Amino acid sequence: KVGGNYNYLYRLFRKSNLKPFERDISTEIYQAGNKPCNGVAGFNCYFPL
Amino acid sequence: QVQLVQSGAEVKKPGSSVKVSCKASGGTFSSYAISWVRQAPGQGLEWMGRIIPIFGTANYAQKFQGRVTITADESTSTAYMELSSLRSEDTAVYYCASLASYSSGWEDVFDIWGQGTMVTVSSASTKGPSVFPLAPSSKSTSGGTAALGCLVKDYFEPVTVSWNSGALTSGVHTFPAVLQSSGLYSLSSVVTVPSSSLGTQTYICNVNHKPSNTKVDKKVEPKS
Amino acid sequence: QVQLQESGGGLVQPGGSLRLSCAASGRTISRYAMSWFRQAPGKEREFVAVARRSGDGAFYADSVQGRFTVSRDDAKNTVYLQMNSLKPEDTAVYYCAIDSDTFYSGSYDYWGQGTQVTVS
Amino acid sequence: DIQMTQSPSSLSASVGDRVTITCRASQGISSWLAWYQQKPGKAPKLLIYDASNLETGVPSRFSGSGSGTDFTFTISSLQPEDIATYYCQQYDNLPLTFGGGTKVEIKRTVAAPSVFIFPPSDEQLKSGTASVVCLLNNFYPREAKVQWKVDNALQSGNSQESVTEQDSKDSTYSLSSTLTLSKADYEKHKVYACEVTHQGLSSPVTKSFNRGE
C-alpha cells in the first residue's frame, strides 16, 4: 500500500530462541526487564509481532 | 470465548469531535488489530478505520482521512474513535471487529465481530409520537377477515410501534417505510381480525421509543 | 392509435404441435407486454401465457406450463406462440392481446382477435 | 473506479436450478477477492473468502470459480431460504469501494392477491389532517400496481410508498401507497380512489371512497 498495510506482521524483537522444527504459537506480552507486563504498561515490554 | 462490545446505542451529532468507545474481551486488547465497520442497509463491509493498538499505527479510507483519530487506552482496556464532519450516509449498524488474522496463517480475514449498535444520527422520528388511526371498508375484504392500521410521523431517533400486550395475532404485517420529504420518518403496521370484531373491540395503537420513553396510545375504529 | 393482426391456425390433426403469431402497427411495443388467451367453441375463456423482456424465461397458466412456449420481438412488434400435444379440451380459438401501460412494469391487458385451432 | 456489477438485477429461479452467474469488474485481479451473501440490513456471510476456495459453513449447493475480470458463481441448487443478495467484493488496494450485487427471489406460480383501501376517519379531520392508504398483498411478482388515482388523477412528489421483501412462507409479495393532505385539498377533491390492474384481472379494479366517512 502507498501509506498503509499494517496487517502484514512479523517478529523484530524477542528474547528467547526456539529449537529447530519446534512448535510455537505464543503471542504473549514481553517482559520489561523487571517482572513482565501482564496487560499493563511498564518500561517497554515491547510487543512480539 | 472472544467477544467485542460497544457502549449502548446513542445519538451522534455533526459539527464536533465525538468520542466513541468499544472494548475487547478475550485475550489482551493488544493482540488484535481492530477494524471499524459501518455496515449500511445497502452497503456491506467497510474499511474506514484500522488500528493496531500496541504499534499505534492506524489507516483510514479515503472518505475519512484527515478529520478522524483513533486512540487505544489499555488502562481501561478500550479503543476510542474521534469522529467529526458527519454526513447523512452514516446511518449504519456499527461494529468494531478483530482483523487479527495474521497469526492465523490466513491473510487478514475478519474473524470476530462485536455486538455492534444501530447509531442514530438521522432525522427519523421519536419523542412525541402523534399516532392516528386508519380504517378500511368491509367491502374490500378477502378470506373472511378485515384489517386495521395506524401511522406516526413527527419530530426526531427511529420509530417502533405496538398495539396491545401481544394477545391476538391472527395476522400482522409491517413495512420498511419511507421518510416524508420534510426529512422526518413515518412507520405503519397492519393487523387483521374477523369481521364481527372489526372496530367494535376498540383496538388501540401504541408507540414508544427507547431514547426517551415517551409512551402514548390512541384508538382505532373501523366500521363493520 | 391501436391496431394489431394475427396469422395461422385452422383445422389440424391432434397429438402434434402448432404455431401462432401476432403483431401490431402504428407504434413501438417495447413499452408494453404481450399475453395470449384461449376459448373453446361456445365456452368461456382461459389463460395461455405472457412474455417478459428480461429474457428470464416465460410464464404460463397452471395446467399449460409443461407444453407451451412464448416469444416476442420488440423491434418488429411481433408475438409468437407454440403449443404441443393437442387434446380434446384445448381445441379452441386462441386470441392475441397486449399488456399495455405507459412506460411501466405493470400493465392492463387489451385483446384483439385470434385464430382457430380445431382438432379433426 | 474498481467496482464490480451483476447483469440480472432481480435473479429469479425455482428450487433446484442450475445457474452460472457472473460478477464482472473493470479491472482483473488474481488474488485478494471474496464473495458474500447478505440480507437487507444484516452482516454479510463469509461464503467465499478466496478464489475457488470454500470455507466452513457453506452448503454444497453454492460454489465459486473464475479468473480475470469475470468470476463465475455456480449454483447447483437455489434453496427457498436464499431470499438475499450476493456480493463480489475485492480488497486488493487501499482506496476501496463496495460492490453492487444482485437481488434473488424464488420463481413460483402466481396467486390471486388481496387488495384493500384505508380511508381516513373524522379524528384526522378534527385534528387538521387527512390521509389514505390502499394496500396490495399475497402476489408473487416483485412489483404491482398501487397507482394513485386522486380524483382520477396521478400524483407524485408528495406521496409515499411501502413495500416488503419476498414472504419466505409461500414466496409472496406486498405493496402499498400513501397520501397526506391539508384541508383545502380534501375539501375540493370529492372522490378518492387508487386503481389496480393485474394479470388475472379483466377490468381495472377501482377502490374509491369519500370525505364524509
Side-chain angles (χ1 to χ4, degrees), chain A residues 3-4 6-14 16-18 20-21 23-30 32-43 45-49, chain B residues 1-37 39-224, chain C, chain D residues 1-48 50-144 146-213:
Chain A
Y6 313 94
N7 273 118
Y8 314 81
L9 263 61
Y10 79 115
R11 312 300 301 291
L12 183 46
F13 184 99
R14 197 56 164 205
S16 315
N17 211 314
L18 192 45
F21 293 8
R23 286 308 312 278
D24 183 58
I25 181 166
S26 57
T27 317
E28 195 270 299
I29 297 286
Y30 174 61
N34 303 349
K35 259 72 199 174
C37 285
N38 276 199
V40 285
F43 288 60
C45 55
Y46 175 86
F47 202 78
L49 263 180
Chain B
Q1 185 172 347
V2 67
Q3 174 72 321
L4 263 63
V5 287
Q6 295 163 359
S7 188
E10 54 207 347
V11 300
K12 65 206 291 154
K13 297 307 211 194
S16 45
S17 199
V18 70
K19 177 113 175 174
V20 195
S21 317
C22 183
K23 292 91 163 184
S25 42
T28 178
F29 206 113
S30 164
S31 61
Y32 309 140
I34 301 306
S35 87
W36 271 97
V37 186
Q39 177 246 288
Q43 194 188 320
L45 200 45
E46 277 76 33
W47 315 262
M48 45 67 85
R50 310 161 264 169
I51 171 56
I52 171 64
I54 192 53
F55 194 12
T57 39
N59 64 34
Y60 313 81
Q62 51 67 50
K63 62 192 78 140
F64 269 25
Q65 301 145 352
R67 60 176 153 136
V68 293
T69 304
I70 306 164
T71 300
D73 189 29
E74 76 292 340
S75 44
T76 174
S77 294
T78 318
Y80 318 121
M81 182 183 41
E82 315 321 316
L83 184 62
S84 45
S85 188
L86 291 58
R87 66 222 170 291
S88 199
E89 184 261 302
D90 185 274
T91 66
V93 278
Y94 262 63
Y95 303 73
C96 65
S98 279
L99 186 53
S101 176
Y102 29 73
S103 70
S104 78
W106 196 305
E107 195 255 359
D108 54 42
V109 288
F110 66 85
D111 42 15
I112 317 298
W113 271 32
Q115 53 89 10
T117 53
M118 182 58 260
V119 290
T120 47
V121 63
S122 159
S123 54
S125 295
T126 62
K127 274 207 202 267
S130 159
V131 179
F132 57 84
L134 289 161
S137 278
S138 81
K139 200 265 159 191
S140 58
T141 74
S142 294
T145 187
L148 305 94
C150 43
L151 177 63
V152 175
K153 187 171 26 153
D154 218 346
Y155 314 124
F156 59 88
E157 284 239 11
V159 175
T160 315
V161 302
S162 156
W163 285 61
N164 312 324
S165 298
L168 173 141
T169 318
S170 70
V172 69
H173 262 277
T174 318
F175 294 90
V178 288
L179 80 172
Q180 199 209 337
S181 45
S182 80
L184 297 188
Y185 191 37
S186 50
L187 183 81
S188 188
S189 65
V190 176
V191 301
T192 198
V193 77
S195 279
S196 46
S197 300
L198 172 81
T200 312
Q201 62 213 316
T202 305
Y203 270 132
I204 190 166
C205 180
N206 186 306
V207 171
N208 62 4
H209 321 107
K210 210 84 200 174
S212 316
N213 270 14
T214 53
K215 195 142 209 201
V216 175
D217 41 17
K218 299 164 265 211
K219 62 158 285 183
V220 193
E221 49 155 21
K223 67 212 160 297
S224 198
Chain C
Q1 184 61 82
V2 285
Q3 186 281 351
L4 63 160
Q5 62 284 1
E6 79 307 339
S7 158
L11 74 172
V12 195
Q13 284 263 351
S17 63
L18 275 185
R19 63 95 191 168
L20 173 61
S21 86
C22 172
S25 282
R27 48 211 167 72
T28 48
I29 206 67
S30 200
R31 304 141 210 180
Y32 303 170
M34 315 304 247
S35 87
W36 296 90
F37 312 133
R38 69 189 71 208
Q39 175 214 307
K43 312 173 231 165
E44 60 157 11
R45 59 132 293 167
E46 270 268 10
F47 263 117
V48 176
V50 61
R52 281 259 179 266
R53 60 203 160 207
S54 313
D56 54 328
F59 165 75
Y60 324 110
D62 59 328
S63 51
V64 75
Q65 184 78 4
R67 44 171 289 181
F68 263 53
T69 82
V70 71
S71 279
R72 183 214 33 60
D73 176 18
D74 299 326
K76 176 61 143 69
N77 286 52
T78 291
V79 202
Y80 263 47
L81 175 82
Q82 304 95 299
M83 60 206 270
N84 331 296
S85 306
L86 278 292
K87 63 180 295 205
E89 293 311 328
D90 63 26
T91 180
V93 181
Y94 277 59
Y95 304 78
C96 172
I98 52 177
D99 274 29
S100 312
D101 255 11
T102 77
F103 264 117
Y104 194 42
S105 315
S107 65
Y108 176 63
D109 289 345
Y110 192 22
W111 60 69
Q113 72 293 311
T115 61
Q116 47 168 260
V117 175
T118 305
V119 305
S120 45
Chain D
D1 50 337
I2 299 192
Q3 171 61 350
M4 52 297 294
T5 179
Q6 294 300 320
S7 64
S9 38
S10 64
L11 177 79
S12 90
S14 87
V15 191
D17 187 289
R18 283 317 319 248
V19 177
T20 298
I21 180 63
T22 75
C23 58
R24 176 201 209 200
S26 303
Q27 65 95 14
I29 52 183
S30 279
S31 86
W32 319 139
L33 69 174
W35 297 256
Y36 303 73
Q37 189 251 34
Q38 187 151 251
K39 325 301 161 298
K42 190 265 153 201
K45 315 298 162 298
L46 279 170
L47 174 83
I48 299 145
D50 211 39
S52 309
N53 184 57
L54 273 191
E55 282 93 21
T56 172
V58 61
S60 88
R61 322 318 315 160
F62 303 167
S63 275
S65 88
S67 291
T69 44
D70 184 324
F71 313 85
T72 79
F73 192 100
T74 80
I75 297 120
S76 37
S77 315
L78 206 169
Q79 68 272 9
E81 182 267 1
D82 211 9
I83 44 165
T85 172
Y86 312 150
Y87 284 122
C88 189
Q89 178 54 18
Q90 64 88 359
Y91 54 109
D92 57 9
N93 293 38
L94 270 168
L96 294 175
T97 175
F98 197 74
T102 187
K103 276 319 306 171
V104 173
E105 62 291 340
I106 309 312
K107 182 38 190 160
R108 200 213 72 231
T109 323
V110 186
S114 281
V115 56
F116 281 67
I117 180 73
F118 300 164
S121 315
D122 283 8
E123 291 86 310
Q124 272 172 262
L125 275 295
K126 64 88 182 168
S127 199
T129 194
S131 293
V132 52
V133 200
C134 67
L135 170 149
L136 165 75
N137 183 38
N138 312 319
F139 65 100
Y140 147 70
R142 196 101 180 281
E143 51 79 21
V146 284
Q147 310 288 297
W148 309 258
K149 304 308 180 100
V150 287
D151 212 357
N152 322 298
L154 191 46
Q155 178 202 303
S156 284
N158 58 345
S159 279
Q160 323 164 80
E161 55 204 279
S162 278
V163 71
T164 178
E165 304 320 290
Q166 285 303 355
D167 276 6
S168 61
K169 291 55 176 163
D170 200 341
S171 188
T172 74
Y173 209 66
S174 158
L175 191 80
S176 308
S177 60
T178 319
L179 271 160
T180 67
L181 302 151
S182 177
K183 282 291 138 285
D185 275 348
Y186 203 73
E187 310 327 301
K188 75 213 181 207
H189 310 148
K190 310 328 298 165
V191 278
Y192 286 143
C194 78
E195 183 195 55
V196 177
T197 172
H198 174 50
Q199 194 91 330
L201 206 49
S202 159
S203 315
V205 153
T206 316
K207 255 64 175 191
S208 193
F209 62 102
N210 302 328
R211 298 139 289 102
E213 170 273 309

